[PDB]
Structure formats: structure tokens, C-alpha cells
Amino acid sequence: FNKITPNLAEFAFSLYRQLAHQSNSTNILFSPVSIATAFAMLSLGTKADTHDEILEGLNFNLTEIPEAQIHEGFQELLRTLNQPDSQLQLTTGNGLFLSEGLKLVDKFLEDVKKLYHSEAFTVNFGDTEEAKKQINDYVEKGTQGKIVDLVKELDRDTVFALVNYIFFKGKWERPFEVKDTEEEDFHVDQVTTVKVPMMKRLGMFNIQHCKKLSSWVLLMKYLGNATAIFFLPDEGKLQHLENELTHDIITKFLENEDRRSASLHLPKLSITGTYDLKSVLGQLGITKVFSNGADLSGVTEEAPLKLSKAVHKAVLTIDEKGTEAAGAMFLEAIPMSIPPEVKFNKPFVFLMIEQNTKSPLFMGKVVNPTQK
């Protein structure tokens, strides 16, 4: 089911095409969910233009959807992410860091902790370096060592910092057997290749070839409550795919429960995506909260405040199947017939959708597994 998801979808695409044009030969990885829910939670401390700008920046038509519904929708999602339709290893969090000395509004801190279950702390921004450590420690501790020293530096007038991260490494509901994981070619160019550990499995896959998107569309079911959608653009059809993607078409794929025999070659990789939300979202029109004109009265009533730091870092690790545990052995009726060998051996885009809410958890493009 969906509620605000269409709003999150178009947000994911906007934020994607944003990074896909600007940045050219880089793996892209961001959580449309972690980011939005973060700025939707922050909007609760904003007022007037400053606020409307955030919600509108998150692809929300304020004139058509009651804000009460926007936040209600986000809570539903987090409810599913806390204790879902299944415990899917997801290490996501949002930490706010405000100056020790600001008389923060209790209500906002309520909404942060209770409503959006986000961590908020007060630090001494007088010691710029200590704040970074203090912050980076939070993330690291929270990602249990996967993310280290996220923030490399803070502005001179930093009094409010936002750190948003998400680490995922799901176990395949239908794993690849490590024995078959050999290293193979990966086309970074039409004439150049690179070697990467290529996983492979002959089986009944929810694979298809969409002519509209000019690409092979593979739906990998995750042991948890998320579904991996991979898009392998045709020869020279990457820009087209990126431009033809629509929440509709993706919902069409989700509702698709067919499967056919295919020899899937999917690379093993652990890509990352570190982004400066101030910059990236500013491009989406969210600027007032990050500047001197920020109306963060919900955060702190009497003293000026603005969002000096807003950083996102998404990490996604794909392999044969999480970690060796209850393997659960299934069997598939594979027809005797030349199955299409589908190799994800060239730039491809992809998304991770939470099965229930259909919220885009991760969106990205792998240009080269080698980069991290």
C-alpha cells in the first residue's frame, strides 16, 4: 500500500536526476526515505516559508495534501521500519546536534524522539573539532563501525547540525551460492572493462525486458520486507531509462509476480553515497532553513538558528546472501530451454522498495563497483 509514497517516489527521481546529471562517472546511492523523513521531521520545527519550502521541496503539494497527512504518512512508514512485516537488517538513523545554550522547545524534542524516533543532542559547537568527533561517533556507533568520520569539517557559525545515514545489507530470500561467484568483466565503457566478483544463478527470476525503458528489469526479493529492482539499460539506453522511469511503471513491476528461467549474473558490491544535503536539497529549492533567514522557532523560540550542517551517507552491500544462517532450501522448476543470460556487467540503475509501503529505501546507479 501507498499513502505519501507517490510523493516520495517523484522526490527520489528528482533527487536522482539531480545527482545523475551533475555528477557524471560516479556510483550514486541515497535513501529517498531516510532523507525525506528527516526533513519532514525537521519541518515540525519550522514555520512559514521556511517550512512550506521543505515540504514542497520534498515533492509535496501543500495545496492538495493536508500537512497533517504528510506527517501521518511518514509515521506509518517508520512504524513499518521499526518492527515491520519482518526484521530486515536496516541501520538507519537521524541525529540532530544543537548548541548547548539554546533553550530548545520541548514540543519539538517530543516530536523528534516520540513521533519520528530521531536522536537529537546538544553539543558544544565552540569546539568545532570535538563536535565532529562527537557527531561522527554517533554515526559510527550507530552503524557499528561501517561509517567513520562522516563530517570532515564544520562552519564557523555552526550551531545546528543534521546527520542522516542508512546502511543496508539484506539477505536474499533466494541466495546465490558462493561457489559460483567468480570474478568477471564489467563494462565501464563500450570498449573498456574492469573485473569484479560476479555472482551467478540459473533460476526462475522475476526478470523481464521492458521495451519502454529499453532495459532488462529484475526484481530481487529480499529476506525481510524489501524488494530490489535492478535496471540494465540496453546498448546506449542509460539516459533513456533514467528519464523514462515513473512511479507508475515501477508500481507496475512491483505488482508483477511472474518469473521465467534466466542465467542471472549480478555483481557483488558494497557501494556508498555521501552527500551534502545543504547543497543537493538546496538545488531542490530547500534553502531558507540552511541560511540566516531560517525560521526554526519550533526548535528554539528566542535565538536565531539555521541548519549549518546536513549530511547524508548511504551504504549498500550486495552479496550471495547476508551472512551464513538458516539458509532455508527452496527448489525451482527450471525449464529445459536456452535461458537468457542476463549479466549486470555495465552501468545500471536500481531501487530498493519496502514491500508494504512501497517507499523507495534506496535509489542508485552503479557505474563501477570498484568505486566505493
UniProtKB/Swiss-Prot annotation:
KW ATP-binding (keyword) present: no
Residues under site feature: Reactive bond: 336-337
Classification via CDD domains: serpinA1_A1AT (cd02056)
SMART domains in the cross-refs: SERPIN (SM00093)
Tissue specificity note: Ubiquitous. Expressed in leukocytes and plasma.
GO process terms (BP): acute-phase response; blood coagulation
PANTHER family: ALPHA-1-ANTITRYPSIN, SERINE PROTEASE INHIBITOR, SERPIN
Entry protein name: Alpha-1-antitrypsin
Organism whose genome encodes this protein: Homo sapiens (Human)
